Amino acid sequence: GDFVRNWQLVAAVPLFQKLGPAVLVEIVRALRARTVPAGAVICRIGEPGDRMFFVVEGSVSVATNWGNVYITADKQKNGIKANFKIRHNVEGGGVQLAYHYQQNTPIGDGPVLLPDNHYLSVQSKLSKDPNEKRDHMVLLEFVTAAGITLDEYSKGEELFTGVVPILVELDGDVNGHKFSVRGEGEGDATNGKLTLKFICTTGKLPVPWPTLVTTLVQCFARYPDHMKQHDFFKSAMPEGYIQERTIVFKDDGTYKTRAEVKFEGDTLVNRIELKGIDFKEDGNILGHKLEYNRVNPVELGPGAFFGEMALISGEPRVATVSAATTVSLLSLHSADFQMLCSSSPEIAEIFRKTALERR
Ligand SMILES: Nc1ncnc2c1ncn2[C@@H]1O[C@@H]2COP(=O)(O)O[C@H]2[C@H]1O
């Protein structure tokens, strides 16, 4: 019943052809098949991991950790403040730190939610559209609020109950290099999910796309039920908020940004002015020495696997994995994973090395 199905499906996984038929029958009896709708989260970062997954149809996207955004109320200015560090990989190895200093002030006169101290967890995947000739960035992002212990007996939030279209506009000036970016896409606050594509409309971007991610809509963060009273960003909608930043690149220049974030009709719009000063023309930013996505460069399609890191290390999921298309999965529980690795040292090696490479 399920076995004839999983037996048919397991043919799409060439890793298992490293296996005799009697044993393969036993493995297929332990596999569980799953159809996953396009866009759905399969594994969430920080969750415990009791199984791993083999892709039989479709592809999945891995979104890796970008860090935490630490937020505090600014009750006297009726807004919030945030500070955090971004670690950009340098292409030859090493890291370029970007220290972020942030303040947000509502545009409207009405009261907003002024939160207790908390943070936003961000995971991201950066990619390219193989049919796009312009300089561009395709971006997938998950944003989750956390840091308030869950005791256990805003009107702006109802603007984000579904999928909201987003428009992003940036005029930049870095060491006199002027440039513009336009981006469009959609925000799903219910799942904390951003999917956008950005174009440099003036030609070649004079800085690396990863350094513009933070500047290019925290109102799409998923605030958990017990934290809805701490979501300043949605509470200031629809009139919106001003968001300003100082971004200090260690041993290099600084970005200063001012943005208007607000609804125009049904569309959440983010309009940005950015000025960069004191950059080194042969440094990591103006010299384009930062990795775009070498860490995590591809969706994982048929024959690939994920979820193996937690089973090897015992640590929680290190990344969020979501279906890019409709996905057909076979999952394998932890205990049967250890037996698979024991029965086939070849397969054990493939897992070991892949998990190392991904670490
Ligand atoms: N840089 C990466 N490239 C590809 N896949 C990854 C990367 N980082 C994590 N993963 C996968 O994402 C999974 C998330 O859950 P696990 O940590 O159990 O195991 C992880 C790997 O399978």
Numbering used by the authors: 10 to 159, 162 to 163, 165, 175 to 237, 241 to 383
From the paper:
To address these problems, we engineered a highly responsive circularly permuted GFP (cpGFP)-based cAMP sensor named G-Flamp1 (green fluorescent cAMP indicator 1) by inserting cpGFP into the CNBD of the bacterial MlotiK1 channel (mlCNBD), followed by extensive screening. Here, we report the development of the new circularly permuted GFP (cpGFP)-based cAMP indicator G-Flamp1, which exhibits a large fluorescence increase (a maximum ΔF/F0 of 1100% in HEK293T cells), decent brightness, appropriate affinity (a Kd of 2.17 μM) and fast response kinetics (an association and dissociation half-time of 0.20 and 0.087 s, respectively). The concentration-response curves showed that Kd values of G-Flamp1 for cAMP and cGMP were 2.17 and 30.09 μM, respectively, leading to a 13-fold higher selectivity for cAMP over cGMP, which is similar to other widely used cAMP probes. The apparent association (kon) and dissociation (koff) rate constants were 3.48 μM−1s−1 and 7.9 s−1, resulting in a ton of 0.20 s under 1 μM cAMP and toff of 0.087 s, respectively.
To understand the molecular mechanism of large fluorescence change in the G-Flamp1 indicator, we determined the X-ray crystal structure of cAMP-bound G-Flamp1 without RSET tag at pH 8.0 to a 2.2 Å resolution. Overall, all residues in G-Flamp1 showed good electron density except for N-terminal nine residues (MGFYQEVRR), C-terminal six residues (GAAASA) and a flexible linker (GGTGGS) within cpGFP. Two G-Flamp1 molecules were arranged as a dimer in one asymmetric unit of G-Flamp1 crystal and were structurally similar with an r.m.s.d. of Cα atoms of 0.149 Å. However, this homodimer was not biologically relevant and is likely caused by crystallographic packing because its dimerization interface is mediated by β-barrel ends of cpGFP rather than the previously described β-barrel wall. Consistent with this, gel filtration analysis showed that G-Flamp1 at a high concentration of 0.7 mM was a monomer. Although random coil and short α-helical turns are observed in single-FP sensors with crystal structures available, the first linker along with its flanking sequences in cAMP-bound G-Flamp1 folds as a long β-strand. In G-Flamp1, linker 1 and linker 2 are in close proximity with chromophore and cAMP, respectively, suggesting the former primarily contributes to fluorescence change. A close examination of linker 1 revealed that the Trp75 stabilizes the phenolic group of the chromophore in two ways. First, the backbone CO or NH groups of the tripeptide Trp75-Gly76-Asn77 indirectly interact with the phenolic oxygen of the chromophore, via a water molecule, to form a hydrogen-bonding network. Second, the bulky side chain of Trp75 protects the chromophore from solvent quenching.
